[PDB]
RNA sequence: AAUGAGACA
RNA sequence: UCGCCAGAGUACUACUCGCAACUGCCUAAAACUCAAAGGACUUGGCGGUGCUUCACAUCCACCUAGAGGAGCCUGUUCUAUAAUCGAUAAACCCCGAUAGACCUUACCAACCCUUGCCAAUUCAGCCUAUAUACCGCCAUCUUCAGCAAACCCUAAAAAGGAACAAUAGUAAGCACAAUCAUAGCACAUAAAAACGUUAGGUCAAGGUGUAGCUUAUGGGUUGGAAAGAAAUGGGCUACA
């Protein structure tokens, strides 16, 4: 299907060109960003499915990775390893298992000669590599591969790196290296803010049980909270209600040292207090030294709660409970 | 009450009934074929009971180079016109009940014995003309499911071969007979025999073999006097090649192991050449109808042994009582001497 | 061949598939193999790394003339005619 | 449980925050714990950090609930320790020197100690064999013991208590009968030894 | 098991179109709907009438085209006018296909009162998503 | 923990 | 070289010879009945068979709230009336009905109408019989993982086809999976769940095969389908 991609290739830079034409565009710098902007315009298609879209790309990219021509006119199998079934997994063997004794052999010399100068480069930790997974493995060497297989290949490689490195062999290794993202769970500090003279007041945003707070603490003033513009004790009569409040200013020793105006709408009296409790955890960060952010996480302040109530299925009379099963 | 009404082809899945429950483990024995009738088979897209010409559908557009318009039909020709259209219906269904006569096999009704043409070509390009192939044997086979029960699975045994010497049998199992028969032909190509024919009408010499409980005996005969043996054994003979042949069967006459035997001892059979060569010496073969004439049909290549073979006077060998009874003239069946019809 | 048995000591089925396909097979049989099914048996060791090495060495030095005498017969034959 | 497996239950108490330098082994615990970015679930609403509350009154409270009227079972609640130490302080009142401190007021010491003593020491469960069962005693664990105390004080308390006498104060007697080794809870529970003591040659049905 | 709208699996040999080879839960998820009108908002009437009009001419339009209709219908309703899309194979010849465009544009926009549009595509034969 | 099937290939 | 064997049941039986046997042993048929009896094997199901492992609403141990008791509401069976039908182990029982004072209505008692809805028709019409002729739409095992087609192998093949330091299997199709929806992700819930099983349910959603009716099993008008001795299921309100 060699031909075909080639026929694929030259439409779609003709069908590119035609579609900058009518975008009143600059052809020379029509990107597939602005193509699949493009074409979201032209056909505006309402499907949930990403993959349903119209699309219009490399046909590289869109066609999947076909396999060469694996023997000439005469039928002679162009690689030494075609009769194995399994040619470029085994080649990949081949090869990775010969680098192995090579460094087994150079290391020999190098024991014989009496100098040391690898350094074992396996600990990428900083860098977070992982090896390849077996999906991605396939579609390197574009061949089906087996969990059996993935597992002794992977750890050949323990093996190869686990001896003293060459500058080729980690050139070979780095290409089997996949680098991790950035692994964090710091939040993002939000910095003081003033207005009108106005000093350290902060604003803070809080969910919980179909109830939104909005919480700004003000930390010039001494103790009190002002919710929807009635005082708290009023709007919370029940003694746990005004206890979750506590317990943010209290795990950090600041009961009176902030003053505070609260609005939060939607749900009932337990909804709207958990609500205000995680608004606040929130709106104190900015207050509070970096080090007590981390305890306030591990008190579990900072986490959204998502336990939300469940539907009701049709045949059934609560969310779980069914109705009763009469066996004769 | 035009909602109301359906697709064709949602009548005929109706209709029919051939997706419900009573055919699935025999409940349906109707044994009537219910036939489906494509009622668009006969269609002149404009032509109505009424009978109008609407120009563009039936009747060309431009008539001598002015446009027609729409026109009705007189009674006589509207009545001709139908005329025409049952006489064709009637036409269809007398080319419906006619069933062409397959070849005649063993029986009337059998499988055995009916050829199925030249087997497929090879992935190769390589065809297959030459070739033929047989069925000796059609069994319905039942396994046990744990869902479905009884699992119905029909099996065939063919035989296939050129006619200058080189035949085969395979077997081929599928759930349904036609595929039954491709998978068969396929298959048997694969395995091929070569039988070497003395003088390409009969077996070198006599063949006596027990393939596991199977007693098989195949005789030498002249020219004149050829295919006396098992209807099956007939079957693979005309596919070999051989033309004159005498066989008897003793014991379990499976099909099976019948074919596997004759071949069996067929490929084990010795020429004139090979006996030649592994004793050094002529072989001389006394024509009865020749005379005394000692007529040679090969020699020993190589060295000739000067030592004649010794002469024993009373030879060791293994009779079949059989043949001594018939040759001393003591087989009295009303059914050994019976003629029959051609080979 | 140069091992007729597998890892669990039964003939290789190369061995058996090779004889159905019509393909000729030269193999070094030990002293508990089948040699019966190959055509071109080679009574030897296969187990000593010396035995081992010294068969492909053989087998590469005749494979390698065989292809260079082709090469050289060739060049023989473009400058006959 | 919309909660994953890498969740896990959130560290409430202050204190094992404010004094992490005297030791060492704990302190590679919680560094980890955030080091390891492992996920720490929401904080509960009846849980809290305040100083006056305790475990076992919030359990307790819990059960005494019906329905969803967690006010309601806090209001019994309060109010039967207030019953509870109305009562200690009016006997503190008339009682001689020595009688004086003897007397204890503290509600949550008296509460403590009662479910201590109303807990069984070995239990009994029933073990098929021969088509026929056979009470067979265990040695039940310390959160069943715990649990089954508190199941006994309710249920005397719903049951055989008049129709006029309220809940708190109900309640607040029997803390007291338990207090001294004399409630008909402590009763119950030398029942249970009663039984068990008598079929202590069936222990050996048992496989565990 | 469900059945509204699927074609059963037996074996690989009998081709299936788009439309036909995704199951009804699938609507809004991979496959649009044939028909576009306002009758089924949040806040329109006259929601029965485009309905039954639905109807007539998936039977009408089935019945004009005799075979020669690939799959089903698109009705685009813009305006006051109706749009209708049809996939025909290669049957009639071209002669008798307008003779049905005009046939059907006529009829139609006297029988509804509304102005009718007719667009035909016509493809080789009926399109194979899978199986086949 | 005793008993059960008729006009399905 | 000797002994024994000529379908199964009748039959280690009847009659007969010998015997320290007398309810005995040995010898050993026939009438009659059937078209089979019998040996070995393959797959499946099952096992109050053994070994190992496992049930997160789950079998036991164990948690909470309820049914069975009473009234009432509603649905079946039975009883009853001139006065529908269908469901009726798990998979029926506030079920078809997200719905009956007339209507609906298909039931009964009376009283009327015979090209009796349409453009035409020696034809309209039928809630007439057949879910055991069916399409449609589902229940169910089932959040079980297997189904089907092409091809190869087996000293024959009914059928089976895996050993990773790998010993005959291969790549695709459907299902699971992944994805999508519940406006972040995650989790969870929805949704999905093939080939088959129960001749499972539905001729009364509608269409239709076959059979039946045609001044009648068709159409219209008026009035009327009461009633609970008793038994039971699912619910609401309680017994504070
Ligand atoms: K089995
Ligand atoms: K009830
Ligand atoms: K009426
Ligand atoms: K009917
Ligand atoms: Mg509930
Ligand atoms: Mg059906
Ligand atoms: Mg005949
Ligand atoms: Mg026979
Ligand atoms: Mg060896
Ligand atoms: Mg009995
Ligand atoms: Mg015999
Ligand atoms: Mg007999
Ligand atoms: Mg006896
Ligand atoms: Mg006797
Ligand atoms: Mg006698
Ligand atoms: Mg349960
Ligand atoms: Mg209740
Ligand atoms: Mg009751
Ligand atoms: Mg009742
Ligand atoms: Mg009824
Ligand atoms: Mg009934
Ligand atoms: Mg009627
Ligand atoms: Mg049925
Ligand atoms: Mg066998
Ligand atoms: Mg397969
Ligand atoms: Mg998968
Ligand atoms: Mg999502
Ligand atoms: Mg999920
Ligand atoms: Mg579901
Ligand atoms: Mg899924
Ligand atoms: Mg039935
Ligand atoms: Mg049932
Ligand atoms: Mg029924
Ligand atoms: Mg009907
Ligand atoms: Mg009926
Ligand atoms: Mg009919
Ligand atoms: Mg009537
Ligand atoms: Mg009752
Ligand atoms: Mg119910
Ligand atoms: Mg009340």
Request: with cysteine.
């Amino acid at each position: 299907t060699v031909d075909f991609i080639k026929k694929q290739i030259e439409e779609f830079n003709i069908g590119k060109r035609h579609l900058a034409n009518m975008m009143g565009e600059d052809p020379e710098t029509f990107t597939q960003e602005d193509i699949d902007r493009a074409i979201a315009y032209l056909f505006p298609s309402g499907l949930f499915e990403k993959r349903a879209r119209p699309i219009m790309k490399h046909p590289e990219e869109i066609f999947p990775k076909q396999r060469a021509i694996q023997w000439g006119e005469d039928g002679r199998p162009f690689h030494f390893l075609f009769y194995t079934g399994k040619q470029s997994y085994y080649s990949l063997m081949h090869d990775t298992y010969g680098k192995l004794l090579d460094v087994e052999k150079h290391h020999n010399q190098l024991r014989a000669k009496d100098l040391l100068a690898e350094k074992t480069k396996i600990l990428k930790d900083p860098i977070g590599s992982r090896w390849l997974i077996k999906e991605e493995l396939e579609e390197m060497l574009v061949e089906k591969l087996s969990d059996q297989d993935y597992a002794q290949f992977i750890r050949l490689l323990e093996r190869l790196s686990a001896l003293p490195c060459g500058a080729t062999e980690e050139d070979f290794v780095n290409r089997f290296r996949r680098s991790i993202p950035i692994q964090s769970k710091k939040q993002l500090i939000e910095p003081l803010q003033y207005d009108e003279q106005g000093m350290a007041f902060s604003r803070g945003e809080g969910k919980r049980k179909t109830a939104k707070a909005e919480v700004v603490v003000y930390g010039q003033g001494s103790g009190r909270i002002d919710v929807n513009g009635v005082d708290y004790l009023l709007y919370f009569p029940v003694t746990q209600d005004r206890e979750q409040l506590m317990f943010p200013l209290h795990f950090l020793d600041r009961l009176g040292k902030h003053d505070m105006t609260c609005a939060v709408s939607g749900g009932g009296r337990s909804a709207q207090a958990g609500a205000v409790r995680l608004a606040m955890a929130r709106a104190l960060c900015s207050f509070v030294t970096e080090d007590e952010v981390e305890w306030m996480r591990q008190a579990g302040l900072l986490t959204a709660d998502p336990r939300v109530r469940e539907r009701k299925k049709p045949g059934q009379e609560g969310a779980r409970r069914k109705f009763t099963w009469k066996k004769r | 009450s035009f909602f109301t009404k359906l697709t064709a082809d949602e009548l005929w899945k109706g209709a029919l009934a051939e997706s419900g429950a009573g055919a699935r483990k025999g409940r349906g024995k109707r044994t009537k074929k219910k036939r489906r009738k494509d009622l668009n088979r006969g269609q002149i897209i404009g032509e109505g009971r009424h009978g109008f010409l609407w120009p563009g559908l039936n009747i060309p557009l431009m008539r001598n180079g002015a446009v027609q318009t729409i026109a009705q039909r007189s009674k006589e020709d509207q009545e001709k016109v139908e005329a025409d259209m049952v006489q064709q219906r009637e036409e269809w269904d007398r080319r419906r009940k006619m069933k062409v006569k397959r070849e005649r096999g063993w029986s009337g009704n059998t499988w055995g014995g009916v050829s199925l043409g030249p087997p497929d070509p090879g992935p190769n390009g390589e065809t297959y003309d030459d070739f033929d192939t047989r069925i000796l044997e059609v069994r319905n086979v039942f396994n046990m499911t744990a869902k479905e029960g009884r699992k119905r699975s029909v099996r065939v045994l063919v035989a296939v071969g050129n006619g200058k010497g080189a035949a085969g049998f395979a077997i081929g199992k599928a759930t349904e007979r036609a595929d039954a028969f491709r998978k068969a032909k396929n298959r048997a190509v694969h395995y091929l025999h070569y039988i070497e024919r003395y003088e390409d009408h009969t077996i070198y010499h006599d063949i006596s073999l027990k393939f596991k409980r199977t007693h098989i005996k195949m005789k030498k005969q002249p020219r004149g006097y050829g295919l006396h043996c098992h209807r099956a054994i007939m079957t693979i003979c005309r596919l070999i090649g051989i033309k004159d042949l005498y066989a008897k069967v003793s014991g379990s006459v499976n099909m099976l192991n019948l074919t596997r035997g004759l071949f069996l001892g067929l490929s084990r059979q010795e020429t004139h050449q090979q006996l030649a060569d592994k004793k050094s010496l002529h072989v001389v073969e006394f024509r009865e109808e020749c005379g005394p004439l000692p007529i040679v049909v090969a020699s020993p290549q190589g060295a000739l042994r000067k030592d004649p073979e010794p002469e024993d006077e009373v030879p060791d060998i293994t009779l079949d009582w059989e043949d001594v009874k018939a040759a001393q003239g003591m087989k009295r069946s009303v059914w050994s001497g019976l003629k029959r019809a051609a080979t | 061949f140069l091992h007729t048995l597998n890892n669990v000591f039964e003939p290789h089925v190369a061995v058996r598939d090779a004889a159905k396909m019509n393909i000729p097979t030269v193999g070094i049989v030990d002293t508990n193999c089948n040699p019966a099914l190959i055509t071109y048996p080679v009574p030897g060791n296969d187990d000593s790394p010396p035995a081992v090495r010294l068969f492909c060495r053989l087998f590469q030095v005749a494979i390698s003339r065989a292809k260079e005498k082709r090469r050289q017969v060739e060049a023989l034959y473009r400058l006959q005619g | 449980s919309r909660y994953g497996p890498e969740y896990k239950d959130p560290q409430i108490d202050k204190e094992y925050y404010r004094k992490p330098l005297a030791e060492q082994t704990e302190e590679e615990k919680y560094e980890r714990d955030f080091k390891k970015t492992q996920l720490i679930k929401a904080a509960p609403a009846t849980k809290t950090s305040s100083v006056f509350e305790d475990p076992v009154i919030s359990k307790f409270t819990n059960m005494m609930m019906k329905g969803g009227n967690k006010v309601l079972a806090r209001s019994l609640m309060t109010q039967t320790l207030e019953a509870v130490k109305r009562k200690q302080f009016a006997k503190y009142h008339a009682a001689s020197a020595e009688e004086q401190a003897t007397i204890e007021r503290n509600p949550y010491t008296i509460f403590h100690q009662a479910l201590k003593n109303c807990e069984p020491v070995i239990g009994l469960v029933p073990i098929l064999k021969g088509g026929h069962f056979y009470q067979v005693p265990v040695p039940l664990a310390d959160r069943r013991r715990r649990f089954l105390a508190m199941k006994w004080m309710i249920a005397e308390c719903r049951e055989k208590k008049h129709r006029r006498v309220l809940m708190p104060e109900k309640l607040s007697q029997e803390l007291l009968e338990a207090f001294h080794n004399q409630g008909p809870v402590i009763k119950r529970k030398h029942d249970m030894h009663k039984m068990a003591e008598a079929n202590r040659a069936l222990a050996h049905y048992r496989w565990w | 098991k469900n059945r509204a709208a699927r074609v059963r699996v037996s074996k690989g040999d009998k081709p299936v179109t788009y439309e036909e080879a995704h199951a009804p839960h699938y609507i809004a998820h991979r496959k649009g709907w044939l028909s576009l009108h306002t009758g089924n908002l949040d806040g329109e009437d006259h929601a029965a009438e485009r309905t039954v009009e639905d109807v007539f001419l998936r039977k009408f339009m089935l019945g004009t085209f005799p075979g020669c209709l690939a799959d089903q219908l698109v009705l685009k309703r813009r305006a006051n006018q109706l749009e209708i899309c049809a996939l025909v194979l290669r049957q009639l010849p071209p002669h008798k296909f307008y003779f049905l465009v005009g046939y059907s544009e006529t009829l139609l926009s006297h029988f509804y009162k509304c102005p009718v549009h007719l667009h035909l595509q016509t493809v080789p034969s009926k399109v194979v998503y899978k199986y086949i």
